[PDB]
Ligand binder design. Structure first.
Ligand SMILES: CCc1cnn2c(NCc3ccc[n+](O)c3)cc(N3CCCC[C@H]3CCO)nc12
Lengths: 298, 270
């Protein structure tokens, strides 16, 4: 069934399957193949695969990866995607000594906040926003990839999987065991990736669930019922947690201007109900140069 | 546009994407008009059987409605189907649905065991790929019960318009669900959008006014659907509404979301 594709290089693993860079023998078109071995699968097509395919076949936006086709070779299921020349984790690493230019950060964040606003409006939670899943091209574009851990949400939401986001980019509401979670979990991840682009170091590089919380608490200050109405009542909340004060964002992210620091702050609000939204974040003065508003009816 | 003002997106945009999705997810009431060996009461007995397995396995009303949507949509792609193929198509539609919606879905064997040997894990594993390939991997529909969820949330919303945190009575939800479960058994429901069917069942338990407030649809939009649901509503009303069941290992804040089973076919005969 994959008779027109020639595997060129192994790209990596990701949420599920194995990613290979392949070439269309006739077309000259380069794709990324995500191969799933059905022969090994006891429950058949994994739920992670079924979700990625159905969610992305309904998510067409320039800042979201394009699923090109799905091919089954009576042993294997291949997901054929658009190929992107680099991932944001490799790029930040290559730029660790240099630094990413602030205009390129602002461009990347803006495009990332657009892909998310689209996901969220189509009622899709990414639940795995980490730099290895954010794919860049040579032209200046960044796209959301790997929807393997994503889920479509209801209006209203209900209890979803707890073991859900990459530890370093995990929102305090997941960590503190809230029953419900939503769109705010992805904005937290983006807040972290934003500061990591600025500082070239992970914002909260915890080694356990408890260390993750403490690292957050040390920087943003231990939360209370005023900053977060509901904390003290939440499952994993312990009154024995050390009491820290919020650090000045001038020390936390020094290259970032007043408008940059404001957006980051609202993106990292403890209260999911108060945390900025992807759409709102687009209207923040930090992008008031890169974007000009549109007339509002009614 | 019944959704309140939204934080994460434009409430009009969200609602219109939701609406435009029913236009991209087609379902036809004359699908057995492609399968001449098949009778509409066969669909009803299978749909009833899947509700029972769902309750047995404590599955969500959502995963049952995903299987129903998958079944009715897969048939519209098939030409000639025998009565014997139905147990396989139904349980495989349920197997895909369970994996998409549940955190800990029942294993492949649990789905084979519940067919009493008539279906092996291998046929389920093959059928699953035929259904998915035939549906063209369009497995994210806004189910009948998905709409009642929306409607019920919009009814129980205060000045702090928190549209995602669930706040509504469980008993009222069940009583509206039961009616929808009873109408889903008759293949004629597919002439009415899932949004319309849900609104109309809500109407039979409330009024035109609440219905419009929570769903957006005008009475004219709902008139032919309420007209058709009229017998079903009375069969339920004649019997008296059911009670909110408890399920072991299932938290009570979600007991209303667990699929249940009754004498739905005996009631359907009317
Ligand atoms: C949607 C599939 C896709 C398309 N491009 N692409 C890239 N491109 C960057 C690139 C290409 C060639 C060599 N080097 O390594 C970097 C990486 C990547 N991933 C990163 C590694 C773990 C798997 C996977 C996760 C995210 O889908 N997946 C993909």
């Amino acid at each position: 069934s994959m008779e027109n594709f020639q595997k060129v290089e192994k790209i990596g693993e990701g949420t599920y399957g194995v990613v290979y860079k392949a070439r269309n023998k006739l077309t000259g078109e380069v794709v990324a193949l995500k191969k799933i071995r059905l022969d090994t699968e006891t429950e058949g097509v994994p739920s992670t695969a079924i979700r990625e395919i159905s969610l992305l076949k309904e998510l067409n936006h320039p800042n979201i990866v394009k699923l090109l086709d799905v091919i089954h070779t009576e042993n294997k299921l291949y997901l054929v995607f658009e190929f992107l020349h680099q991932d944001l984790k490799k790029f930040m690493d290559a730029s660790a000594l240099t630094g990413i230019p602030l205009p390129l950060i602002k461009s990347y964040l803006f495009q990332l906040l657009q892909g998310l606003a689209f996901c969220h409006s189509h009622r899709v939670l990414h639940r795995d926003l980490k730099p290895q899943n954010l794919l860049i091209n040579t032209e200046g574009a960044i796209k959301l990839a790997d929807f393997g851990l994503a889920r479509a949400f209801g209006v209203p939401v209900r209890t979803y999987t707890h073991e859900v986001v990459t530890l370093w980019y995990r929102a305090p509401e997941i960590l503190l065991g809230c029953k419900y979670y939503s769109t705010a979990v992805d904005i937290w991840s983006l807040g972290c990736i934003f500061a990591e682009m600025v500082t070239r170091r992970a914002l909260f590089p915890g080694d356990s669930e408890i260390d993750q919380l403490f690292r957050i608490f040390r920087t943003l200050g231990t939360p209370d019922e005023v900053v977060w109405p509901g904390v003290t009542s939440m499952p994993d909340y312990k009154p024995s947690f050390p009491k820290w004060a919020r650090q000045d964002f001038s020390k936390v992210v020094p290259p970032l201007d007043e408008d940059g620091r404001s957006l980051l702050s609202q993106m990292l609000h403890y209260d999911p109900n108060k945390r900025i939204s992807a759409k709102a974040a687009l209207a923040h003065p930090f992008f008031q140069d890169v974007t000009k508003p549109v007339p509002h009816l009614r | 546009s019944p959704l309140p003002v939204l934080s994460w997106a434009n409430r009009e945009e969200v609602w219109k994407i939701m609406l435009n999705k029913e236009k991209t997810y087609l379902r036809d009431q004359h699908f057995l008009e492609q399968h001449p060996l098949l009778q509409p009461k066969m669909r009803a007995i299978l749909l009833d059987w899947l509700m029972e397995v769902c309750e047995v396995y404590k599955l969500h009303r959502e995963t049952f409605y995903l299987a129903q949507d998958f079944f009715d949509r897969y048939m519209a792609t098939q030409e000639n189907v025998v009565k014997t193929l139905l147990q396989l198509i139904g349980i495989s539609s349920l197997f895909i649905a369970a994996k998409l919606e549940e955190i800990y879905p029942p294993k492949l064997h649990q789905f084979a065991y519940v067919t009493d040997g008539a279906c092996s894990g291998d046929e389920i594993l093959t059928m699953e790929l035929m259904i998915m390939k035939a549906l063209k991997w369009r497995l994210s529909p806004l189910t009948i019960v998905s709409w009642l969820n929306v409607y019920m949330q919009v009814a129980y919303l205060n000045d702090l318009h928190e549209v995602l945190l669930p706040q509504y009575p469980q008993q009222i939800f069940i009583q509206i669900a039961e009616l929808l479960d009873l109408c889903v058994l008759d293949v004629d429901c597919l002439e009415f959008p899932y949004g319309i069917l849900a609104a109309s069942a809500l109407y039979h338990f409330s009024s035109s006014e609440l219905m419009q407030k929570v769903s957006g649809y005008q009475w004219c939009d709902i008139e032919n659907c309420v007209k058709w649901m009229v017998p079903f509503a009375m069969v339920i009303r004649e019997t008296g509404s059911s009670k909110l069941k408890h399920f072991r290992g299932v938290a009570d804040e979600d007991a209303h979301n667990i699929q249940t089973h009754r004498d739905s076919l005996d009631l359907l005969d009317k």
